[PDB]
Design goal:
Helix content of chain A: 40-55%
Subcellular location (chain G): Cytoplasm
Distance between the termini of chain B: 38 Å
Radius of gyration of chain B: 17 Å
Number of helices of chain B: 7
CATH architecture of chain A: Alpha-Beta Complex
Number of strands of chain B: 8
Order of helices and strands of chain A: EEHEHEHEHEEHHEHE
CATH superfamily of chain B: 2-enoyl-CoA Hydratase, Chain A, domain 1
Largest sheet of chain A: 7 strands, mixed
CATH architecture of chain B: Alpha-Beta Complex
Largest interface: A-J, 38 and 50 residues
Largest sheet of chain B: 7 strands, mixed
GO biological process, one term (chain G): protein quality control for misfolded or incompletely synthesized proteins
Strand content of chain B: 15-25%
Number of domains of chain A: 1
Oligomer: part of a larger assembly
CATH class of chain A: Alpha Beta
Pfam family, one (chain G): CLP_protease
CATH topology of chain A: 2-enoyl-CoA Hydratase, Chain A, domain 1
Enzyme class (chain G): hydrolase
Structural class of chain B: alpha/beta
Main location (chain G): cytoplasm
Structural class of chain A: alpha/beta
Radius of gyration of chain A: 19 Å
């Protein structure tokens, strides 16, 4: 509901905006819902547009997502990797499931988290029973195994870890503090607070 | 069961009840009871108390045919309410043995129904309506002694009768009275 | 194992033992279903013994008029007398049936409450249809009053006036209004 | 529901509108839903406003309505009759129940229908049971008979038919082709197609 | 849903509006829903605003309401009476329950109805069972009797009728044609149609 | 049925139960049982175990009148919980033969109800409330020996009693022991 | 859920629009939902407005509709026929039930379909049971037969087929490829692709 | 639903507004729903903003509320009391529960009601059963008793009545006519009608 | 729920847009929901409008769709083929069912996917039981066999595969990696990442 | 449901705004709903934006929240701490659960409450049963102990209390008046009313 808008002074003129837009004006994409197909498109569109508006400047992705569709994950991931610009990933609170992979998928050197951030990794789930003939189910299961090994493959690529190890570690849900996530190779740095009541 | 036990004790007295909406389920039980009773004793009368707001025509015709085909006479008693098929069945009682309790109400009206499907399908349903309507009237005319033109006219909408008015219209032969019983 | 249905269920078994004592109950909303069972019980009892009284305990908030008239006619046409006992609550058709008991044999338990009021109903269809429903209302209303007036000995004008809205009676007040002949106590 | 909007050139300026608004700019009111109380108010407001904007020019009412509340009917009717301006009624498609009376209630000489239009007339219904004390129900029923005889009275006024005849004919649902409706006196003319070929 | 908007020419400039707004610009308030609390507030706000914008000019209230909350009725009523400006009430179709009282509560001389309008009056109802301890219920009932006698009082004030008579007449639902409503003292005049064609008569 | 069979074996011991919300249905079965038992043996006592959160007043008065009109004495036993009509009926037991089990709880409070229609209708409902309330208090005062003013006061809201407190208030004559 | 808008340059000024509006600016009406009463009004209003904005220029109607109310069909039909301007009908995908008749009802010479379009014809249905007294039901059934024979009549008028034949062919659902629809006289031409 | 907007002439320019906005422009806050948390925030925000826009001028609060959350009541109350500006409270129809306290909490001398207004006071309720361990429930109950005695305390402060007396009177629901409410010390004056006739 | 908008500087003026609009300004159509009738129309309208705005320039179609109505598929397909302009298809994530055919239906040489894209092909399904007389059901089944063989025909046309082979391969669900989809002839190239490192 | 907007005069021009926007223009963020993920993002976005618009000026956070997700709490908390600007926290009514920690997490010296404000603290709950294998549940339980000890740790940091003591005190729900909350070290000052009388 209550998301205020505001106005920016200038000599050129006077413009209305939101926080989310202002953020976007600064090449910041906010990834904060469940990674459902709809929202994934919205993210890709944003990525693709930013690249188009200025290919040389960095894109930053703010992450606070409780998780999402493996199906949509790879799309976003490809798009991230694909665009000309560097991607800076920032976990603000939580990066879970899919969102964890994306956090990890930022350009190396530019993956971050706030200190009390929380990264959670887990193999692809499927709640909701899929009903069917055994034939259709074996195909399904095959697909899920592919999807699983692909998630592991791509995490491996970006953490510097062996894929087999990722598989072992993600068999069950795996929760990482920001520090732990750094050790694991999911992020490069942990953001220090920049309060002006520092020195 | 208690209720059942009472209806059973009464059943062995050759007394049956029609006390609700006439469905297939209720119709079949009734037809069975008549079959059963007619088999036990083909000579003795069956008494059929009716307190029913009517119901399925098809299901009601099962009862009617079953009544007509029975070897024994079938006396009908309208108590409280005899409406639609309720009235029909009441009026189908063996002639001279159709009774109304004095504050019973009889309701006569044309058939209800429904229409659905393709235009071809509906055409057919409609053809049936004509046939059924015609037939139901023919019978009510026969039962009551009224001319079919009047049955049709009066049946157009809900037509209510007191016991007295029902007697004169010909639904019923007698009205019952007092502790020491009566007729008309 | 032992001791099942001499009378199938416990509740039923009790009502049955009482039924053989010529005691019947009207304990709920008067529907067709309940009415028919009652009419049956009266028919049954009258056939068993035409001379002996039937006692009809009433604790009912009322119900269907049509269904209630089935009972009433059945009561009236029974060879034997029918004693009515108001216990707890006799409302609407409940009161009516109570008051229809054989005169002199209508009882109220002392903290029973009697409720008299005009019929309720509904109005459904095309304007032609409604016209007809309405005509019936007039007939029924007139008749129900006529009867209550007869039962109670009150004039029909007063029955009409008092019935306009919920009219409550204590056992005492009911006795003097003429719904009931006696109050039990000891 | 995709309903396009568009823009109108002019020397005075440039304005956005819909079809319905453009229609309204031409003093055409579109009556196309079920005549519920809400929509009836909307219609009256439109009538009242058009009269106010220019009392001398005709108001046209396009009708394609599957029917509606008798309660709201008389309001619209009174408003139609009441305003200074002539009312031109046009049945595109269907004018049922209430909408039929309104169609009929246009100013004489100006009641029309497209050729395959369809007018349906029927006495006031009441689906939904109304529960209550008999006393309340008799009052209700009285009201419904008043409402019925008033519908017939006002149809009679506008068709040139006797009210008793209307009552006979509407006892049951009565369906009129455009031609039949003209004969009946509900519309004055049946629109001929004006295609340039 | 389909309520068109339009545009008004002028030398000062060019403005977009609705019917309802245009009506409001003419100091006409439209009372057409059920008188629930929300809508009542909307009405009072409108009244209060109109008074503020120009206290000397009349406010007109168009009425076509199937009825409403007694609670909100008195608020609207007080506000109507309270504001500086005269209130002109016009029943377009139906004025029921609360809306009837309001219609009647217009400034004398300025209460009207269209010919086939329909006024309905009835004592305060309460559908929905209110559950509770007897104590709470007696309080409730007391409040409803107060509310009932206040409705009658205020109708009496404005119709010129005795309150006891109102009570009798409203015991049950009471329906008035426009003519009958005039006789009853709820409106002052019945609007004649002003069609420019019927004006050979 | 098993449950029924147990209740039946008990019934023939002149022991009846009031174990739930007092509706018309439950009331009528109880009144029947008393009628039945009184007819079997007018001299011998009836024992009425009560574990009920209360219920319909009207329905409860059926039982009460039935109890009062019975030829035989009616002993009442509060077990677990006797609330509202539950307490009333308990307290209506024949004087000297009202018992509480030691951890039973008694609840006394004023009647509940509802208010429905037109203002005229509501006026009438309300008039009845006054009557009923007055009467229910009068009786509880009679049963307990408390003055009607105290009954009224205490009944205003939920008033809880332990067995001990109930004994001294006069709901019950004895507490059973071991 | 998302339909983009865009902006058009010009010397006169700069205007925002949708696809559907831009289409409308070109005198193209899009008929794409179920023909319920609400949408039928929307169509008529569009037709009537276009005629008013410029009576001499053609109106084109793009059709991709899974079907609709017979009640509303005849209204739209009358309106199409009635307006001054020629109506060009184009089936993009599917023209079913009512929509098929409309497709057919375009001005002759100007009825088209894309190659894999699909026309479906069928007599008036009525899902939902209509309950009632027999009297009311006979009236209903009468009405439906009228409605049926009118659908056939008007199709016959526009296809050049005999009405009796239409009745036979539509007894049951009838599906036409674009080619078949042309043969049947529902459209005049089948659009060839114009790619380079 | 149907809440018209309008336009204000001036030499400085031409502005669109609602009634509610126009009211706000006059430093009038409309309190008319149930006092749920959401709306309470909306009220505080309005109060806090008005104070900010002009601290010296009075803020007026129009009240017609069927009641609300005790939780949100104290917030609004604190805010009312806290801001620089005087608060003028006006009961238009009803001021119930929470709303009653607020009405009462206006600055002394400036608390009013229309003649047929109706004030209702009642101790804090809690519909909805709160389930839990006894430990958690005793804490809850404690909190409710605090909340109750605080409501009474603050009413006492503003009516000039003793808190114990307030508690007696509010044990059960208590309904006050405008006149009675004045006597009770909830409002200072009862508005007389200002009709020019 | 949130999709930011932004503003574009220029000397001519200053314009607001979304990502989707900006995309559209670049002749990119985004196909990302389930291919229901509504959305299909929206796609066609976009196609038809882009062709109209500039017939010579390429239209690009971004695809990430979990699948859709066969009914609507052929419409979009026809429209894609029909317009003057070349169609460039790009699978961003998933192109399933219908969407797979469309991906394939791009103009040859211009069909692409991102590396981890995923194409899924399957014969036309029908969840939801269709009830009916056998006669009506045989007609239905006929229709669905037509629809099936048409899907296969048109895939065959665009992949260079034999229709019978398509039928065999799609009997059951068939999933293709981007590479595999290229081999299969559904896309022409697999997009390489263009990161400056 | 109804939140008025208004207009601000100036020589530079004339602007429309709400209360919430006007508040935001003054670097005031309003935290008033349940701290669900959606709203938490909205808060962070606001914080981050304010820092960006002017890093040296204080940000004020108005709190009236009935509580919220521990998950989102830490995010907001990190963001608060992280931004360059000082954070001023103000409890207007209620600061519960998460909101209490945030209130406490303001920059020292700048944590306040109105006099009748109410702070509630409680260990992390989990309504809704989480179903699962024991293995998955042990991991869950572990997580929730981490989350608990982290809430305590960070409260300890900001109140100057020992974490073990916090744990004892929050075992069960703990409710603090504004005064008590000051003693506890959750706020620095209790706002005095500033009414011009």
């Amino acid at each position: 509901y209550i998301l205020p808008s505001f106005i920016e002074h200038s000599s050129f003129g006077v413009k209305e905006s939101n926080p989310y837009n202002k953020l976007f004006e600064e090449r910041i994409i906010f990834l904060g819902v469940q990674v459902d197909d709809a929202s994934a498109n919205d993210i890709m569109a944003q990525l693709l547009v930013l690249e188009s508006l200025d290919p040389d400047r960095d894109i930053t992705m703010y992450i606070n997502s409780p998780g999402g569709g493996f199906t949509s994950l790879m799309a976003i991931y490809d798009t991230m990797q694909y665009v000309r610009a560097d991607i800076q990933t920032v976990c603000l609170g939580q990066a879970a499931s899919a969102a964890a992979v994306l956090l990890a998928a930022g350009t190396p050197g530019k993956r971050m988290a706030l200190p009390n951030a929380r990264v959670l990794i887990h193999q692809p789930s499927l709640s909701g029973v899929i009903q069917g003939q055994f034939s259709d189910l074996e195909i399904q299961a095959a697909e899920i195994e592919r999807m699983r090994t692909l998630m592991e493959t791509t995490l491996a690529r970006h953490t510097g870890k062996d894929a087999g190890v990722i598989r072992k570690d993600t068999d069950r849900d795996k929760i990482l503090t920001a520090e732990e996530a750094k050790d694991y190779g999911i992020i490069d740095t942990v953001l220090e607070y920049r309060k002006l009541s520092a020195q | 069961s208690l209720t059942d036990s009472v209806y059973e004790r009464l059943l062995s007295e050759r007394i049956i009840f029609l006390g609700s909406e006439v469905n297939d389920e209720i119709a079949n039980r009734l037809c069975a009871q008549i079959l059963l009773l007619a088999a036990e004793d083909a000579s003795k009368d069956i008494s059929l108390y009716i307190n029913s707001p009517g119901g399925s025509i098809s299901a009601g015709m099962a009862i009617y045919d079953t009544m007509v085909l029975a070897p024994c006479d079938i006396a009908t008693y309208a108590m409280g309410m005899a409406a639609s098929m309720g009235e029909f069945l009441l009026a189908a009682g063996t002639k001279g043995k159709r009774y109304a309790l004095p504050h019973a109400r009889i309701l006569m009206h044309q058939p209800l129904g429904g229409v659905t499907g393709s235009a071809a399908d509906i055409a057919i349903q409609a053809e049936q309506f004509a046939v059924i309507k015609k037939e139901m009237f023919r019978l009510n005319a026969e039962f009551t002694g009224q001319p079919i033109e009047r049955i049709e006219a009066d049946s157009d909408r809900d037509r209510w009768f007191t016991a007295a008015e029902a007697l004169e219209y010909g639904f019923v032969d007698h009205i019952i009275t007092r502790a020491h019983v009566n007729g008309e």
